[PDB]
């Protein structure tokens, strides 16, 4: 079977720059290389067939070239909506095979998160569990640090984080940190605080609430 | 407009069976070659099976990894293609796309995918709690609110806002596997703080494998 190698797997470029994705075949595939785009939670979409024919409805900044074993997908001036995984596929020989994908990150200016904290709902509290949620919204770059303090005592082992994929509208990320306690432990303390550090914040940002106010 | 719409995904025990369906419109179904292509974090995009036209004996082809376990079939009178899976394995877990391949070249149209989970754990529907805005979720003229979708299995759940009328500013986080073995996620949205208490905000949670369809009004 023919292996398609897409390397690098990760590309990061500034907006308005030209980017090229590499696809190399372990065997001759002629010009029978097709390119797809897959946005987050979306379906693959055919961009270029047979190495270099863009499909109708595909913006002109997309192009492709190559023949034999070495193929390129280029975007001539990248915008944020181009953030996606990019896949090559060969139909020279059966079975048809896909590359492993290259992810496109589009850089942007530093953006500090907006920070929000959510007490556990009364509805959840009646079940014996308290989830406290801290949201870091629309920030860049991706690296951020979130610490929970409960009556100024730093929490450990009782929280989980989730991060979105980069946003194709504004090139940001968002993060949630969920602190889970029993209703018993929750009711034993007063001050619940989320403390956030990020390249875009000149000092750590704390959001907090007093249980029952 | 070409549309492919899959259905039938869900949870099945290792060694179990499950049949996926896909219904196509917008092209002459009986003239074309229908495919199933699956996707997983580990194996990427993987062609699974193809059934070609009735004119050439409706010939079926399978990836080596599913040969003998999967059967692809079609019903031209319904514009439907089916994938009968048997002797399922943990590594068959993934998203299964219905796709048209143009006579052995491009996969030129794709469905939205349906999700298969091969696991011995049980289906469990989610609990939905509001993430209520106050001043501690008011950053200037922007407020945040959301829904917490807790303790469910398997993936996926969909969350929409105001029945899909509210899409700007929505962030539905990837699920996290909890130590309990159950998933949990939150969906949030940022709105003008002036619209709190004057505009209604409802999250529409759907978790198909448990027939959960819950609408939660999120209030201050």
| A182 and A138 co-located in one domain | yes
Take residue B66 and report the two structure tokens written for it.
Answer: 């599913």
| C-alpha distance across the termini of chain A, in Å | 65
From the centroid of its chain, how far is CA B69?
Answer: 23
Are residues A46 and A34 part of one domain?
yes
Data resolution in angstroms: 2.2
Cβ contacts of B127 on chain A, cutoff 8 Å: 124, 127
Q: Output DSSP code: residue B209.
A: G
Distance from CA of B200 to the nearest CA of A (A): 18
Residue A71's beta-bridge partner residues? Answer: A23, A66
Chain B partners within 8 Å of A124 (Cβ): 127, 129, 148, 150
Q: Yes or no: say if B107 and B99 are a contact pair by the CB < 8 Å rule.
A: yes
Whether the CB-CB separation of B193 and B138 falls below 8 Å is answered with: yes
How far is it, in rounded angstroms, from Cα B22 to Cα B4?
Answer: 7
Same domain (yes/no): A87, A122: no
- Asked if A163 has any chain B CB less than 8 Å from its own CB, the reply is yes
In the block, residue with structure tokens 């875009």: A200
CA distance A134 to chain B (A): 9
Among A83, A108, A133, give the residue marking a domain's end. A108
Distance CA A124, CA B112 (A): 33
- Residue carrying structure tokens 């696991």: B119
Give the integer Cα–Cα distance in Å for B85 and B18: 5
- In chain A, helix, strand, coil percent, each to 5? 5, 50, 45
Peptide bond into B211 cis (omega under 30): no
Same domain, residue pair A179 and A191: yes
Q: A43 vs B110: CB contact, 8 Å cut-off?
A: yes
Q: Which residues of A touch B108 (CB under 8 A)?
A: 46, 49, 55
End of a domain among A69, A89, A108?
A108
CA gap B112, B66 in Å, rounded: 22
CATH of the domain at A196: 2.60.40.10
Between CA B193 and CA A64 the distance in angstroms is 46
Distance from CA of B194 to the nearest CA of A (A): 16
Residues 6+ apart with CB under 8 A from B77: none
Specify burial of residue B59 (Cβ count, 10 A radius: 0-12, 13-18, 19+). exposed
Tokens at B8, concatenated: 């039938």
Interface A:B, Cβ pairs < 8 A: 129
The rounded distance, in Å, linking the Cα atoms of B69 and B2 is 30
Q: Please check whether residues A119 and A103 belong to one and the same domain.
A: no
Rounded to an integer, what distance in angstroms lies between the CA atom of residue B117 and that of residue B13?
8
- Same domain? For A8 and A54 the reply is yes
Please provide residue B87's backbone torsions phi and psi, each rounded to the nearest 5 degrees: 45, 50
The reply to whether residue A44 touches residue B45, judged by beta carbons under 8 angstroms, is: yes
Contact A139, A182 (CB under 8 A): no
| Residue B51: strand, helix, or coil | strand
Tokens found for residue B111: 């469905």
Give the count of domains, chain A: 2
Residues A205 and A192 reside in one and the same domain:
yes
d(CA A90, CA B105): 8
Same domain, A167 and A99: no
Contact A6, A101 (CB under 8 A): yes
- Half-sphere exposure at residue B1, Cβ-oriented, CA atoms within 13 angstroms: 4
- Taking an 8 Å cut-off on Cβ atoms, the answer to whether A98 and B47 are in contact is yes
Q: Are residues A116 and A76 in the same domain?
A: no
Helix (H) or strand (E) holding A124: helix A122-125
Q: Over A146-211, what HEC string results?
A: EEEEECCEECCCCEEEEECCCCCCCCCEEEEEEEEEEHHHHHCCCEEEEEEEECCCCCCEEEEEEC
What tokens were used for A136? 């870091």
Based on the fold, state whether residues A54 and A114 are members of the same structural domain. Answer: no
Distance from CA of A2 to the nearest CA of B (A): 13
What string of H, E and C letters represents the secondary structure of B123-155? Answer: CECCEEEEECCCCCCEECCEEEEEEEEEEEECC
Residues A117 and A72 placed together within one structural domain of the fold:
no
Q: A-chain residues within 8 Å CB-CB of B113?
A: 43
**Distance (Å, rounded) from C-alpha A123 to C-alpha B68?**
50
Three-class secondary structure of residue B56 per DSSP:
helix
- The answer, for A160 touching chain B at a CB cutoff of 8 Å, is yes
- For tokens 């692809």, name the residue: B72
CA dihedral A24, A30, A31, A32 (to 10 degrees): -80
- Boundary-marking domain end, from A108, A127, A158: A108
Q: What angle do CA A30, A32, A35 make, to 5 degrees?
A: 135
Q: Please tell me whether residues A86 and A134 are part of one structural domain.
A: no
Residue among B204, B214, B170, B210 nearest B190 (CA): B170
| DSSP helix/strand/coil, A83 | coil
Full set of structural domains in chain B with CATH: 1-120 (no CATH), 121-220 (2.60.40.10)
Q: Which domain holds residue A124?
A: 109-213
Q: Which helix (H) or strand (E) holds A11?
A: strand A10-13
Q: In the structure encoding, which two tokens stand for residue A15, read together? A: 């907006």
- CB-based contacts of B168: which residues, under 8 Å, 6+ apart? none
């Amino acid at each position: 079977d023919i292996l398609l190698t897409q390397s690098p797997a990760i590309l990061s470029v500034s907006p308005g720059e030209r980017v090229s994705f590499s696809c190399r075949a372990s065997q001759f595939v002629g010009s029978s290389i097709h390119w797809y785009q897959q946005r987050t939670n979306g379906s693959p979409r055919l961009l270029i067939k047979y190495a270099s024919e863009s499909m109708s409805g595909i913006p002109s900044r997309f192009s492709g070239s190559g023949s034999g074993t070495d193929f390129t997908l280029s975007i001539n001036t990248v915008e944020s909506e181009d953030i996606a995984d990019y896949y090559c596929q060969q139909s020279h020989s059966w079975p048809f095979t896909f590359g492993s994908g290259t992810n496109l990150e589009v850089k942007r200016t530093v953006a500090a998160p907006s920070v929000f904290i959510f007490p556990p709902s009364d509805e959840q509290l009646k079940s014996g569990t308290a989830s406290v949620v801290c949201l870091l919204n629309n920030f860049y770059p991706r690296e951020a640090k979130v610490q929970w303090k409960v009556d100024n005592a730093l929490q450990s082992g009782n929280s989980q984080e989730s991060v979105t994929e980069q946003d194709s509208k504004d090139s940001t990320y968002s993060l949630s940190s969920t602190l889970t306690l029993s209703k018993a432990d929750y009711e034993k303390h007063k001050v619940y605080a989320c403390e956030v550090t990020h390249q875009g914040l000149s000092s750590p940002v704390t959001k907090s609430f007093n249980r029952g106010e | 407009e070409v549309k492919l719409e899959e259905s039938g995904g869900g949870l099945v025990q290792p060694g179990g069976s499950m049949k996926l369906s896909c219904v196509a419109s917008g092209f002459i179904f009986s003239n074309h070659w229908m495919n199933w292509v699956r996707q997983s974090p580990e194996k990427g995009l993987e062609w699974v099976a193809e059934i070609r036209s009735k004119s050439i004996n409706s010939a079926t082809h399978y990836a080596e990894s599913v040969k003998g376990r999967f059967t692809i079939s079609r019903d031209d009178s319904k514009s439907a293609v089916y994938l009968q899976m048997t002797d399922l394995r943990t590594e068959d877990t993934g998203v299964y796309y219905c796709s048209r391949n143009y006579y052995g070249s491009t996969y030129d149209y794709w469905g939205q995918g349906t999700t298969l989970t091969v696991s011995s754990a049980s289906t469990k529907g989610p609990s939905v709690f509001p993430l209520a805005p106050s001043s501690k979720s008011t950053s200037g003229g922007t407020a945040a609110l959301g829904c917490l979708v807790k303790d469910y299995f398997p993936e996926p759940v969909t969350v929409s806002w105001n029945s899909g009328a509210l899409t700007s500013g929505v962030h539905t986080f990837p699920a996290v596997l909890q130590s309990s073995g159950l998933y949990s996620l939150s969906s949030v949205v940022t709105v003008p703080s002036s619209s709190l208490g004057t505009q209604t905000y409802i999250c529409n949670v759907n978790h198909k494998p448990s027939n959960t369809k819950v609408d939660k009004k999120v209030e201050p």
